Design a protein around this ligand. Structure first.
Ligand code: ZN
Ligand code: ZN
Lengths: 337, 336
């Protein structure tokens, strides 16, 4: 049931072979874990998306990075092909209306909304008229906005998932604000809650904290280090992904199931072995009632001596058969009153 | 603020001076942290609590250990004194009703109830007569019991805390069942929840998990390995107590404040730089309306271009002054 999502973003680096080699290593990292898994792309129609005025420029963030790692629809369909080949849910973040169109053509199963497009209303309209599940990130979103967006998606019957994240790239430990996962969970009932992250140096605890807080979907950026290919400071390599899942794996075990009222057999005998048994202080005749004079409490009990945990201060029991003084009051020897 | 209770139990090994040195070793472990701390004893009037039928016997668990580590009241009084002097809160688990009297006499501040005495009504009824906050452990209680005891104390006006714990000494990782913390927060709303634990072969993650589920009171057994005395495996030394607390602190750091909605400049400025700005696709006369006909969306914007995230179907825009084809719609040029 937990779903983990692996964000490639642009870490294919403009290169498909690399990106195929990265999906396949991520599948290797998943060996043995019993979760759901999705792989994520980012769709921008670079023609429309980067404005004429900013083409070829680098005096501002992201333009150059976007232009350099550009991939053609032909090649983007190729990656989906592998994604699915390996058993990943194909997941994608459109930033354009036209990229939604494209997501459809590619038979992608799910739509992520990035935090930046969270209130990109025209983009939302385009997504709403789609018929796939939605995963929305909410970094620095106002409550009133997330409300609008939740309400609007939920009305008109969408499968929605809302994710905590922070738009600091990478995110200081100081600054993960994981408490927010619960804030979101409490604000919005019957909406899946998740956590998308820019934490990683190889951290490991945030995920446990995240699971504990009742997030059910988890997104992390991934990439494959290589000689002549670097990695950024918020993207995990295949070695740290496996660890990432090992951590969640552990946290689930340590957490157990909150459903279980059910009780261990150790616990029960242990607990008895520390309880106070009820003893007669004085001979008690047949049909004598048991009172504050005549009994006392002391440990430890024998089976199935009546214990203090069953005593009452009002008159509850008479002795069916006589009890010797200083003897354990056995519970099979008492008729209730 | 979070409360950390250190369970001494009978880890004073029956020696007052050792108990003292323990308290002192643990005060050091606490240096620097902005938490509350308590040290906890275990009170049993043994003359009376261990039944004659069982005195001198090592035939079944605990009897021996209790007898062997016996401390007199004057000696318990010295420990409480020490605890207070290092600025610890004084806490105790009484197991019989004479022990509650001694708690009152010794000036102990909080009453802990062990899981085995959780439904010990006669003890409960004695404990209810004190006016000390109650902290209550819950291992293997059935729901109806927790319900009963909970309302019992709450209706009495008690300042109650409910702990999750597990009666396996020590508790396997497998078996911590840390999500009872959430369960219990959810069934007993308003009631403070903590977690008392019997875990570590050095474990640091469960406290981080405890804290993340909103436990606020934590208990752990503690000891001072000495070679003259060893230490059992569900109780922690001073080194590993600091680690424990550091794990807690780190978790709080990573969690931050649920009720804080202030967003950063760094964050806000980050988001803007990935957003679609708004560009005029044909010329736009002054006092002319802006529609889907005349605007495209593209990236990136600049201070302070209109942004798409402000293209609501509920909002009309008219140009103050004329806008050229292919130009940024600059907000200061419109009319909400
Ligand atoms: Zn991201
Ligand atoms: Zn204990």
């Amino acid at each position: 049931k937990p779903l983990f999502i692996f964000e490639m973003a642009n870490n294919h680096m403009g290169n498909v072979e690399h990106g195929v080699a990265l999906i396949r290593a991520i599948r290797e990292s998943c060996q043995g874990f019993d979760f759901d898994f999705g792989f994520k792309l980012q769709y921008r129609n670079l023609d429309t998306f980067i404005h004429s005025s900013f083409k070829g420029r680098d005096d501002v963030k992201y333009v150059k990075r976007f232009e350099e790692t550009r991939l053609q629809p032909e090649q983007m369909q190729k990656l989906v092909a592998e994604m699915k080949a390996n058993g990943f849910k194909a997941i994608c973040t459109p930033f354009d209306e036209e990229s939604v169109d494209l997501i459809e053509a590619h038979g992608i199963e799910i739509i992520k909304i990035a935090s930046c497009s969270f209130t990109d209303w025209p983009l939302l309209e385009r997504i709403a008229r789609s018929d796939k599940p939605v995963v929305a990130s909410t970094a620095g979103a106002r409550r009133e906005d997330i409300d609008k967006v939740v309400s609007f998606m939920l009305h008109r019957g969408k499968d929605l998932t809302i994710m905590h994240c922070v738009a600091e790239y990478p995110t200081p430990d100081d600054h993960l604000h994981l408490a927010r996962i619960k804030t979101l969970r409490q604000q919005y009932a019957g909406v899946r809650i998740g956590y998308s992250t820019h934490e990683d140096p190889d951290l490991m605890e945030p995920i446990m904290l995240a699971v504990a807080q009742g997030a059910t979907v988890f997104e992390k950026h991934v990439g494959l280090p290589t000689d002549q290919y670097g990695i950024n400071n918020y993207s995990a390599n295949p070695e740290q992904v496996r660890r990432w899942l090992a951590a969640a794996a552990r946290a689930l075990a340590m957490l157990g199931d909150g459903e279980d009222d059910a009780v261990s057999e150790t616990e029960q005998a242990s607990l008895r072995s520390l309880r106070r048994g009820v003893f007669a202080t004085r001979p008690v005749a047949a049909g004598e009632a048991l009172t504050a004079d005549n009994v006392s409490f002391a440990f430890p009990p024998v089976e199935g001596q009546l214990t203090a945990n069953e005593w009452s201060k009002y008159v509850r029991y008479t002795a069916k058969t006589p009890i010797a003084a200083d003897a354990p009051v056995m519970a099979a020897d008492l008729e209730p009153v």
